[PDB]
Ligand binder design. Structure first.
Ligand SMILES: [Cl-]
Length: 194
């Protein structure tokens, strides 16, 4: 079939982009071939073939990723040439994995230093914009969770202050993008001095 006309891409979400084009005039269209790839990894292309239609929503894409697309039409006369490339970028998401390497060390009777590294690069789904640290006493009177947020992305540690003396705490660390919070780490236990 003829090169598809008015081929366009619309971002729908962090994982979905809708492609659309014109139905070809007076052609016995049989199927379409959609070739797509991430701009950052142009050696890895994907093709999906499908029955005739004028729109296709690609799903399960990677968040915050610039994608490129080309479309070809197969008619009873065979497959034609591909469209020029078009592009669209999926939205960001929240992180899909916690901060890694979480450690806690007592720094006195009422202070604990929490340290971490960012979640793996492929699970950030956007630029990491803040961290939060949650803590909860294991024993003692206040058994509630307390959360410190707004920790800037350049921090790799944070001091929890004002804790109770000789008290054990659970500590969890969580990453955020502009979209919102990701999951928190598995808890690390730490006890204050004296
Ligand atoms: Cl929390």
């Amino acid at each position: 079939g003829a090169q598809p006309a008015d081929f366009q891409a619309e971002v729908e979400s962090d994982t979905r982009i809708q492609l659309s084009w014109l139905l070809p005039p007076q052609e016995r269209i049989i199927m379409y071939e959609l070739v797509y790839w991430a701009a950052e990894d142009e050696d890895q292309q994907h093709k999906v073939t499908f029955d005739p239609t004028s729109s296709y929503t690609l799903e399960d894409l990677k968040p915050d990723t610039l994608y490129r697309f080309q479309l070809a039409a197969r008619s009873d006369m065979g497959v034609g040439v591909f469209t020029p490339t078009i592009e669209a970028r999926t939205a960001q998401s929240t992180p899909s994995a916690p901060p890694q390497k979480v450690m806690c060390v007592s720094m006195g009777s009422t202070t604990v230093r929490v340290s971490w590294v960012p979640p793996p690069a492929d699970s950030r789904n956007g630029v990491i914009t803040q961290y939060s640290v949650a803590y909860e006493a294991v024993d003692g009177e206040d058994r509630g969770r307390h959360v410190v947020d707004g920790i800037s992305r350049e921090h790799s540690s944070w001091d929890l202050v004002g804790l109770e003396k000789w008290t054990e705490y659970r500590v969890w660390v969580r990453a955020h993008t502009d979209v919102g919070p990701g999951p928190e780490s598995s808890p690390v236990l730490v006890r204050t001095d004296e």
